[PDB]
Symmetry: C2
Subunit: 119 residues, 2 copies
């Protein structure tokens, strides 16, 4: 059970991630998550995604280049993808026709955590 999670006011983002990792770990999942080069970071993420059984990401604005590449990685490898979208791109909305993708639309954090528990 390995999960790859593709991820001031930025404290809200950090809080939502830590809540998610905790939520996943308490359901028996293993999250594949300080001096590192882009060569090593890219190498680590790819292998982590390659080894994971479930892929979870947060597509949206501002568009993260790294996240979308990782989405492309997971979809091409045929991984199990869960996309948490707040309510986008054409390739995001039609990604399901190419790989196992489950969308979860939310407006608040509490909403997607409950929906994710159901799925």
């Amino acid at each position: 059970k390995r999960v790859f999670l593709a991820a001031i006011m930025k404290e809200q983002e950090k809080k939502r991630i830590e809540d998610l990792i905790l939520f996943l770990e308490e359901k028996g999942w293993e999250v594949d998550n300080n001096f590192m080069s882009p060569d090593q970071c890219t190498k680590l993420d790819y292998d982590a995604i390659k080894e994971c059984d479930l892929f979870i990401a947060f597509p949206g604005v501002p568009v993260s280049p790294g996240t979308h590449i990782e989405i492309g990685w997971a979809s091409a490898m045929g991984k199990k993808i869960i996309l948490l979208l707040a309510e986008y791109a054409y390739l995001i909305r039609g990604l399901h026709t190419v790989s196992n993708v489950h969308y979860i639309i939310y407006n608040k954090e509490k909403e997607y955590l409950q929906k994710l528990d159901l799925y």
Copy 2:
């Protein structure tokens, strides 16, 4: 073989048409030839799956679709050429993508520059 091209606004259209022409005149077949996101995503994936060379323009503003396609090409083990404008620092996964798939970077400041460099690396 077949090459996939992941791509004011008048300047962007001009640079693409020049590139397709440039590729076709070197014997390449560009995979361009009202539809839904379900069909568009399906077409791009298969086109990338079938191509022998992948060319993209990473940069700002960040295109979600382009970067997904980059992830597609890299995971499939396709031949990738990334044309980056200085600068550049760009994303970590872009700069380190070479360690995972066959990626060749071409840094440019003007259109004429990358077209010449692309002619050399071909």
